[PDB]
Amino acid sequence: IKFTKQSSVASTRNTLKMAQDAEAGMNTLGMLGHQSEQLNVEGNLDLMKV
């Protein structure tokens, strides 16, 4: 039972850690805002239509 609890603590440590790691979702979203502004290209395209 002490061994099992030690294994559980080790795995919860790893779990929190990987959760933090995924929390990459920020670099993705921030850059998606960046490229969203870049696609807002649309301004140039409208001007070409005129």
Binding site: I1, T4, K5, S8, S11, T12, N14, T15, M18, A19
Partner: protein, 44 residues
Amino acid sequence: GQQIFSQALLNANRRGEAKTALAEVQARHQELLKLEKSMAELTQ
């Protein structure tokens, strides 16, 4: 003119019937590795 000692009997034998505490201890481990695998997939 007498003295005695005493010996305890530990009992708590519901736990002792099994290893000791396995209700929310060994099951927690069981489902916690599952959390680990699913999180590994989520981060992947």
